[PDB]
Amino acid sequence: PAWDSPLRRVLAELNRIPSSRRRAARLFEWLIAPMPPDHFYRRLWEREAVLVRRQDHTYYQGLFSTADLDSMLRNEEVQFGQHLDAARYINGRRETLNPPGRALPAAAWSLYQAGCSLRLLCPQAFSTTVWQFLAVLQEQFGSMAGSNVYLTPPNSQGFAPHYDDIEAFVLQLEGRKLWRVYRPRVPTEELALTSSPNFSQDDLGEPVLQTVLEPGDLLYFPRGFIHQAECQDGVHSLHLTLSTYQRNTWGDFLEAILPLAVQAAMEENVEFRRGLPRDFMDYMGAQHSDSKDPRRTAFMEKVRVLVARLGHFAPVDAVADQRAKDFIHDSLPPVLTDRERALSVYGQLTTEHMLQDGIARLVGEGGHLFLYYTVENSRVYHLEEPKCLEIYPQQADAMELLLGSYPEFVRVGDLPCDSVEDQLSLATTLYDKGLLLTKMPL
Amino acid sequence: WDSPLRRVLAELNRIPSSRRRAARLFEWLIAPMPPDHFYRRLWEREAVLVRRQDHTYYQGLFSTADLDSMLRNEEVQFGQHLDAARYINGRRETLNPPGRALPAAAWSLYQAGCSLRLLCPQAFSTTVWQFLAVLQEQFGSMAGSNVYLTPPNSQGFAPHYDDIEAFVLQLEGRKLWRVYRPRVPTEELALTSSPNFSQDDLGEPVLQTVLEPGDLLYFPRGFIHQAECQDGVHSLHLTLSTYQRNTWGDFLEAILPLAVQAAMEENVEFRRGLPRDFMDYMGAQHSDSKDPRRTAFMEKVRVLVARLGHFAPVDAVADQRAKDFIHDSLPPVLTDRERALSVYGGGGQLTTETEVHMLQDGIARLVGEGGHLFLYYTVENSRVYHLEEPKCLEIYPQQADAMELLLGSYPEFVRVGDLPCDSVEDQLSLATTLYDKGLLLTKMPLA
Ligand code: NI
Ligand code: NI
């Protein structure tokens, strides 16, 4: 019997699936199993919270353990604040207790002992298993996948009730914790855009979901959904919560669209460049909130039709590209399979495909062309400034093909350039930067 | 001594609404055209020339002498208040010798061919002031002016197009004007001043004339123009300029981010996630894409942008622009009646029995900002653009219903004791603060 924890099983499996994309689907299919991904997104994602009773306390064995924390605190410069917070919720308040500087096992555990909950901002940096997990999942999210690990001692609550500004996937890892989740309390909170203030017990009402998680379980809920948790009994609780979809709304897309749309409208269409009525302020202003004038209301219309006309002028593509750019510079660097590694520079070449599917994007800025890529990003968010390189027009077509036709191999001498000077400097540059894998080791 | 201008100004002084005075002065300025026809058909559309057959028309406004007495009796200074300019053989060349333009240094440059341009004459001329201060009331946007003096057989400026509606009042001498239709759709009602052009680049003048004292030549932004003196006579024209940056676009530029803001706060569809993989079908790279779900994204966009209108704070922006107009506005020119009835001659011991209305119709805006109410006003502005910071005063919610009344019902007199106000201390306080601040007048001389 090849394997022991379905995590280790499925992880090994991904190393045997050749398409980074396909790997990405898979892992998520696993994450919410038995449930279909397709049914989840269509009806549940952003719609409702979700418990997955796994029945398998060993489901996640290998991802992260109390031990792995204990090592980290010993073997790495874990700093209170920057990497680790000590939290308490008692008598209805939260108290944070971060002794300045360095977070040593001694101190950490002595805080844990005093009822504090331990929260590890960024264990993707230190654990390479978590790193992989995220870096695979983020490719099917089209949005940064981040994660924190929470440890709560017996008979204590770490944090107050609140709603985040992200989609949360709680994975129970060890122990048992009593959760209470709530549906958005009012229209304006449904899919909220800002973390909420710390709420008290009167502030809320009756939960839609109230469960005790056990290792292997998964609990998911959309942003705006309030939630609190606690240890009871005598057992510790460990969980990793995965999070994404921060600032990834149509709204936030529109914000960028519109300013450029109006600029365009103004340069290209003259109606946008005409002068306002001269006496418009005789009927427009808070001061005339209530004018009977029937040109108060024509003005109002003209603003709407003109606003509607902007739909036509909006650089929809140009902004999609710019958001991707941000996802790239936002992304955790790729976890390679063994096959990929070996075929790549990480493991010469001649006129006889893409390293992975989600590591690079081509983006025209200022009549130029830049290929932005992930493969030199830290395992800390934005610790690296964005990384690109300049494509010259001659090679644009080729580069576009390479990205559009993964995972299909292409002969270097079938890359639609002008010359064979081009075809070689493109595959050469790409290959060295770790963007490109060969079918036979060079 | 007695010209049409002198006559219309003495007419304005007998017209009690400040809003009628403005209309009437414009009617005078573009006569014999009716303004009604001008603003519907020709404003922003066509160049317009008024052959007036009257040299005396603008007599009073400004003369060459008035420009001398300026130079010698006020610190007029090169760069800042006065520019010399020359166009010869193809190039403009600018020559502002640092320092204080006195007459010696001025006339020399005039003699050497330069055209003199006076940037801020309404500061020193009190007729130009009245002229602009009245006309801005009916343009609803800043009315600026410069005065251009040009010696014979010369040309001061290269051909350009401006970013403003321009009215040219020919005051002395003669000048050959050439006006040219916007050359391409993107230069029609253009957004910024053009680079100086070379006579090779320009098409066929849509209009060409010699202007004589008393004529008026209007033409919209975008329209290319240039002028030259010929014969042996000089030119002296004032150009009145307006409507800078006062477009439906500029209104929208402001609306939008507030509208998107409100839309997200106030409606869940905007707060929803993009989809997980849209950048598989939406990119510059995937410009040409086949995805079908693409043309769905595209529509979602257009349909949400459509929705955003129905979220736009159109009043609140109007109000902000009002507030900027107020700041840009020249300070008002009082009739002798306004002056006699207001804090310019007699002082605040009034009563519930005093009848009162606002001083003029265009000196104040009431604007709600940060849960507060402020009356912004022009009566303390300078006759120099933006020299003073925005002036205003706070209105407490127990007065706002009065204050709105007062502004709405100019020029109807309202007994003080009939002001919607909860108390009689409140009643008197508004009236008094408003009067002493010089925003109010009484029907009867206070003393
Ligand atoms: Ni939370
Ligand atoms: Ni000009």
Residue numbers in the entry:
A (entry chain B): 179 to 525, 529 to 533, 537 to 626
B (entry chain A): 181 to 627
List passages from the publication reporting this PDB structure.
Nucleolar protein 66 (NO66) is a JmjC domain-containing protein which has been reported to be a histone demethylase and a ribosome protein 8 (Rpl8) hydroxylase. Nucleolar protein 66 (NO66) is a metazoan JmjC domain-containing protein that is highly conserved throughout evolution and was initially identified as a dual-location intranuclear protein. Evidence from a recent study indicated that NO66 hydroxylates ribosome protein 8 (Rpl8) and controls the biogenesis of the ribosome, which is consistent with the observation that NO66 is a constitutive nucleolar component. Moreover, previous work demonstrated that NO66 assembles as a tetramer and that the binding site of NO66 to osterix is located on the surface formed by a hinge region (interface I) from neighbouring subunits in the tetramer.
We had already produced two mutant proteins, M1 and M2, lacking dimer interfaces I and II, and they exist as a monomer and a dimer, respectively. To further understand the role of interface II in the regulation of the activity of NO66, we determined the structure of the mutant protein M2 lacking the interface. As predicted, the M2 protein forms a dimer with interface I. The overall structure of monomeric M2 protein is almost identical to wild-type NO66, with an r.m.s.d. of 0.37 Å. Interestingly, when the dimer structure of the M2 protein was superimposed onto the dimer of NO66 coupled in the same way, we found that one of the M2 molecules in the dimer moves outwards compared with the wild-type protein. Interface II, which was deleted in M2, pulls these two subunits towards the other two subunits to form an NO66 tetramer. This tetramerization may further facilitate the shifting of the subunits when NO66 binds to its substrate. In this context, we proposed that oligomerization of NO66 might affect the motion of each subunit in the catalytic process and thus control the activity.
